[PDB]
Design a protein around this ligand. Structure first.
Ligand SMILES: C=CC1=C(C)/C(=C/c2[nH]c(/C=C3N=C(/C=C4\NC(=O)C(C)=C4C=C)C(C)=C\3CCC(=O)O)c(CCC(=O)O)c2C)NC1=O
Ligand SMILES: *[C@@H]1O[C@H](CO)[C@@H](O[C@@H]2O[C@H](CO)[C@@H](O)[C@H](O)[C@H]2NC(C)=O)[C@H](O)[C@H]1NC(C)=O
Ligand SMILES: *[C@@H]1O[C@H](CO)[C@@H](O[C@@H]2O[C@H](CO)[C@@H](O)[C@H](O)[C@H]2NC(C)=O)[C@H](O)[C@H]1NC(C)=O
Ligand SMILES: *[C@@H]1O[C@H](CO)[C@@H](O[C@@H]2O[C@H](CO)[C@@H](O)[C@H](O)[C@H]2NC(C)=O)[C@H](O)[C@H]1NC(C)=O
Ligand SMILES: *[C@@H]1O[C@H](CO)[C@@H](O)[C@H](O)[C@H]1NC(C)=O
Ligand SMILES: *[C@@H]1O[C@H](CO)[C@@H](O)[C@H](O)[C@H]1NC(C)=O
Ligand SMILES: *[C@@H]1O[C@H](CO)[C@@H](O)[C@H](O)[C@H]1NC(C)=O
Ligand SMILES: *[C@@H]1O[C@H](CO)[C@@H](O)[C@H](O)[C@H]1NC(C)=O
Ligand SMILES: *[C@@H]1O[C@H](CO)[C@@H](O)[C@H](O)[C@H]1NC(C)=O
Ligand SMILES: *[C@@H]1O[C@H](CO)[C@@H](O)[C@H](O)[C@H]1NC(C)=O
Ligand SMILES: *[C@@H]1O[C@H](CO)[C@@H](O)[C@H](O)[C@H]1NC(C)=O
Ligand SMILES: *[C@@H]1O[C@H](CO)[C@@H](O)[C@H](O)[C@H]1NC(C)=O
Ligand SMILES: *[C@@H]1O[C@H](CO)[C@@H](O)[C@H](O)[C@H]1NC(C)=O
Lengths: 30, 451, 149, 50, 99, 50, 50
């Protein structure tokens, strides 16, 4: 579905980007 | 002095858009070519204001309105009268509007500006009345029916004399007189503004600022008010005092103040020329955030918000540990005065509230603490004592109280956290042959230590 | 706030309706004052003075000898407690009759109204600045120049 | 402009003018008030420099 | 009565109110005060554990003392407000963004 | 100053303004209260003092 | 994460929870505790911004 090449997929799966809701408790927005 | 009028015609109230009127100088400090953001009592922009008009409609059974009702004061009033024939005359302020409480009175009786705060017994329909005489073609004040009595009062001010015109004018309304009344911290603050206009109804769209006039040091409670009109009597109004009258055309608008934040523009002469209401609509909110009347194009972060919680719940463990507190009271046999029983209670939950009201003791009194407070605090190793006395020792048995030998047997400490729970016992401690079971001390060598 | 209301206290769940019965106490109770009592029993007369500031032209304060007014030379001043130092001069900014003194962006007072003659005056702090020294180095000589900025 | 506006805050004291604080207080009781005001303005100035 | 000599032994005649969920309210569970949405949970506690926590010591679970059930905590929704404007000169309309 | 110097009041203490400086400052519409209380209460009138 | 962790610190106050201080203390004593917590958290936020 996303027109990404092979190397782009290999590069996107090597970086790991609930913590978000835990930080959301005290007015921290992303 | 009362003449309670008749011949009024029923009419629904009318309402008007207030436009952007009602800005006054909030502080006594000169400013020029600056924009000042301040929060205070201001009239919100584009609000429905009540429009009371006095006019006599011609024709058979025409609409005859004499609107002088009681209006709540809330936290301040904006009062704007459009006038051509001098009908609106003064104001009456108070809480009960009778002799029970003080009542402020401002009146412009065509000669002086009379301000009184006296315990008037105000009439149900107070007014002033102008009589028009046909032969001389002159208008003169003739009726002063405002208060039945005046007593018990301190403040009074009267101004210089003047001779005011009283002619009933045809045509269109041309004078605009607008006032702001505030009551803050014992001070009655008055602001005013005057302007020539030309309009048959509603308010002009032009903007205008209001200048402080006086701050009366009164300090009376105010929650209601009323206005005063000048009615017309002549040969064209036959009848008694209650019906033989007509009202000249006049109109006044009433609006209520609310706590708001405004951005005020001062010109180079220091006269307020523009204002922005910071809670009207998102554009005005953006203007207040950016501190300017002009905003360029883009996206602006302007505020925050939250979903307000609607209820509140409290959960605590199911209580299943009752006390033997009620068991010591339900004692089939009581101990002697000298051998007063001491009960220790611990590792339980205090429950005095249910016992206090249900039992309905004869003498329940407590010092230094309220029973409700006792439920909201903590104690360690609760102690309980009980004994039997007669009626006279009840007065004697008290903190910091002395008395007879029996009183000396059980001496309460001078500073003692506790309280008395006594009740009569006649149907259970009475013997036809004399109850000699219990024994007391009438003579003792010396006194006894507390507890 | 003051309260002179005299109604039966109704802490208990019983409608007293002015009966002064059981659990219906009268909230207002009386002192007992006699000279032959303890050290802490003697009555005390308490008088509390309360002030308020910066709300109107001053009307109550002490008797200091008001001095003459001197201008165009920056001197200490005391205008109704608004102390400070600076040059006083004639003002051209017209004051509305109810206004007392003007302020600026920094919330600093730069205009006052004279309490005696009822006239407006400007307040401009005395001249001041920084001083810099131009030197060629003590290794060479000991002459220096001064720069007022 | 933010520095100038920050110059005129309370920071916990009674009033924001040193002359006013000195005028109506004994130094033993004005020292703490002035100390609060000083630390406030010092934090403001350090923020501006950074 | 006496105090300030030993740990308290008799305290707190406590009244209880009904429980409501799916609307964010103020809650109090054995002194644990806060606000938020209460909802059903799937995480399982050990028998003696009272309330859970997260990586950032945020209370994201609780146990109801009476019915012995595990409830969650989810704060009332919030966010910034943004105004999209084409310029005060060109027009006087705005579009509001809740984020 | 001269007024309370002669009167020799037993209890006197002023909050937020120094008694010695009182002659200098200028006020607006000073208030004055008056009542009679029990001895303990005389050591019990103070701002924020329960 | 650290910006959140700074919330669970007394900074010299009686208790790190804002509500629990006011729950069991009168206004004019708890005022200083709240004022200490406020400046502690404000400095912890300034550090993150820088
Ligand atoms: C209540 C009805 C009311 C009437 C009928 C009234 C009449 C009235 N007020 C005037 C001036 C004035 N009247 C007032 C003030 C007052 N005048 C008062 O009757 C009261 C109570 C105040 C004060 C709150 C002032 C300040 C002026 C001078 C306006 C000016 O020239 O700037 C004048 C002469 C100048 C003119 O007409 O422009 C009249 C005829 N004023 C009123 O307020
Ligand atoms: C502003 O004016 C009055 C405030 O009381 C409201 O008047 C109502 O008007 C409707 C018709 O639009 C009538 O049906 C009601 O009977 C009126 N209320 C009365 C007479 O008490 C008016 O609705 C207000 N406007 C808003 C937006 O609140
Ligand atoms: C308007 O009210 C004033 C205030 O009462 C009236 O002035 C008084 O008039 C009577 C009449 O003789 C005098 O005895 C009082 O001394 C006046 N009081 C003053 C001057 O303070 C005034 O007469 C009223 N207007 C009319 C037309 O009667
Ligand atoms: C000021 O306004 C009124 C006038 O006394 C008071 O409101 C009354 O309060 C009593 C008791 O709560 C009620 O029975 C009356 O019905 C109220 N009057 C009205 C018109 O609603 C109010 O308590 C006063 N407050 C003070 C501090 O004096
Ligand atoms: C005031 O109005 C009431 C209402 O009917 C009336 O009973 C009373 O007589 C009036 N008072 C007068 C006319 O003095
Ligand atoms: C007209 O009014 C004046 C007012 O002073 C009065 O003296 C005069 O008598 C009146 N005219 C007639 C015909 O009564
Ligand atoms: C009101 O006047 C009467 C005189 O008839 C007086 O007895 C009463 O004390 C006065 N009310 C007040 C509150 O002073
Ligand atoms: C400001 O004051 C001056 C001085 O009288 C006057 O000429 C001018 O018309 C006033 N208004 C404006 C908007 O400048
Ligand atoms: C215990 O005493 C209470 C109040 O004194 C009373 O209501 C209750 O009926 C008693 N229980 C008995 C006698 O079993
Ligand atoms: C100045 O500096 C030079 C270089 O070090 C040195 O030789 C000399 O002695 C110094 N003093 C003078 C020139 O007076
Ligand atoms: C309290 O009442 C609830 C409701 O029935 C019950 O389930 C529970 O077992 C009782 N006891 C405790 C300790 O919760
Ligand atoms: C926008 O501003 C410019 C310059 O101030 C002006 O020429 C133009 O007419 C303005 N736009 C509108 C729609 O008035
Ligand atoms: C009592 O009042 C008189 C009034 O002449 C005054 O002279 C005297 O000093 C007062 N006594 C005091 C203040 O102790």
């Amino acid at each position: 579905p996303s027109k990404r090449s092979f190397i782009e997929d290999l590069l996107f799966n090597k970086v790991t980007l609930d913590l978000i809701c835990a930080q959301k408790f005290n007015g921290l927005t992303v | 002095q009362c003449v309670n009028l008749t011949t009024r015609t029923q009419l629904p109230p009318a309402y008007t858009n207030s436009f952007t009127r009602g800005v006054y100088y909030p502080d006594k400090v000169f400013r020029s070519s600056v924009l000042h953001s301040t929060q205070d009592l201001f009239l919100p922009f584009f609000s429905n204001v009540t429009w009371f008009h006095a006019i006599h409609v011609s024709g058979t059974n025409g609409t005859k309105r004499f609107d002088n009702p009681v209006l709540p004061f809330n936290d301040g009033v904006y009062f704007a009268s459009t006038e051509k024939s001098n009908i609106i005359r003064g104001w009456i302020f108070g809480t009960t509007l009778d002799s029970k409480t003080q009542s402020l009175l401002i009146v412009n009786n065509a000669t002086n500006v009379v301000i009184k705060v006296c315990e008037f017994q105000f009439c149900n329909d107070p007014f002033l009345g102008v009589y028009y005489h046909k032969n001389n073609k002159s208008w003169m004040e003739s009726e002063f029916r405002v208060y039945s009595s005046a007593n018990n009062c301190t403040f009074e001010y009267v101004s210089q004399p003047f001779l005011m015109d009283l002619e009933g004018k045809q045509g269109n309304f041309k004078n605009l007189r607008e006032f702001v009344f505030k009551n803050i911290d014992g001070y009655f603050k008055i602001y005013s503004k005057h302007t020539p206009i030309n309009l048959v109804r509603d308010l002009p769209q032009g903007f205008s600022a209001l200048e402080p006039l006086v701050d009366l040091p009164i300090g009376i409670n105010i929650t209601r008010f009323q206005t005063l009109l000048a009615l017309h009597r002549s040969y064209l109004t036959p009848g008694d005092s209650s019906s033989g009258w007509t009202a000249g055309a006049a109109a006044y608008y009433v609006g209520y103040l609310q706590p708001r934040t405004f951005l005020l523009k001062y010109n180079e002469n220091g006269t307020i020329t523009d204002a922005v209401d910071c809670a009207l609509d998102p554009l005005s909110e953006t203007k207040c955030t950016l501190k300017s009347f002009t905003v360029e194009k883009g996206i602006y972060q302007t505020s925050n918000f939250r979903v307000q919680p609607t209820e509140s719940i409290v959960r605590f463990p199911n209580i299943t540990n009752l006390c033997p507190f009620g068991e010591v009271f339900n004692a089939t046999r009581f101990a002697s005065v000298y051998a007063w029983n001491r009960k220790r209670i611990s590792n339980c939950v205090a429950d005095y509230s249910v016992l206090y009201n249900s039992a309905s003791f004869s003498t329940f009194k407590c010092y230094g603490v309220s029973p409700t407070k006792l439920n909201d605090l903590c104690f360690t190793n609760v102690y309980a004592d009980s004994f039997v006395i007669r009626g006279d020792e009840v007065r004697q048995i008290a903190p910091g109280q002395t008395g007879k030998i029996a009183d000396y047997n059980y001496k309460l400490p001078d500073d003692f956290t506790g309280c008395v729970i006594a009740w009569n016992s006649n149907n259970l401690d009475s013997k036809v042959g004399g109850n000699y079971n219990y024994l007391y001390r009438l003579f003792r060598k010396s006194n006894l230590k507390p507890f | 706030e003051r309260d002179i209301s005299t109604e039966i206290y109704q802490a208990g769940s019983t409608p007293c309706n002015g009966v002064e019965g059981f659990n219906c106490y009268f909230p207002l109770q009386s002192y007992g004052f006699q000279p032959t009592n303890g050290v802490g029993y003697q009555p005390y007369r308490v008088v509390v003075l309360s002030f308020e500031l910066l709300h109107a032209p001053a009307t109550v304060c002490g008797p200091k000898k008001s001095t003459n007014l001197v201008k165009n030379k920056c001197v200490n001043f005391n205008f109704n407690g608004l102390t400070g130092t600076g040059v006083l001069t004639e003002s051209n900014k017209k004051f509305l009759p109810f206004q007392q003194f003007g302020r600026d962006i920094a919330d600093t007072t730069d205009a006052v109204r004279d309490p005696q003659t009822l006239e407006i005056l400007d307040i401009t702090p005395c001249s001041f600045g920084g001083v810099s020294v131009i030197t060629p180095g003590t290794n060479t000589s000991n002459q220096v120049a001064v720069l007022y900025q | 402009n933010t520095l100038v506006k920050q110059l005129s805050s309370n920071f916990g004291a009674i009033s924001s003018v040193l002359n006013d604080i000195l005028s109506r207080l004994d130094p033993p009781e004005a020292e703490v008030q002035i100390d609060r005001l000083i630390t406030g303005r010092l934090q403001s100035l350090q923020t501006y420099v950074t």
